[PDB]
Amino acid sequence: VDMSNVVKTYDLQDGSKVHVFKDGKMGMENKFGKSMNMPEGKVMETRDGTKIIMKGNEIFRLDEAL
């Protein structure tokens, strides 16, 4: 990815990464750094312990309040 404009990276347990850009664009790359389409409504477990899901170009994350 071009990290110039990346505002956030979710490092996923399977090795892949989800990047969010400053214009709100979103990117995923696989464990080898290859662009791939982000799965919609698939829960994705992160390296730092939480879980995210994308739906309608938005990222939802496990609610820490709970």
Report the nearest approach of a copy of itself to the CB of residue 32 (Å).
25
- Residue in 4, 34, 35, 41 binding a copy of itself, rule: CB under 8 A: 41
Nearer Cβ to a copy of itself, position 34 or 64? 64
38 binds a copy of itself (CB under 8 A): no
Report the nearest approach of a copy of itself to the CB of residue 20 (Å).
5
Token pair recorded at residue 47: 């390296």
Selection from 45, 43, 50 nearest residue 65 by Cα? 50
Planar angle of CA 30, 33, 35, nearest 5 degrees: 65
Q: Which residues pair with 5 in a beta bridge?
A: none
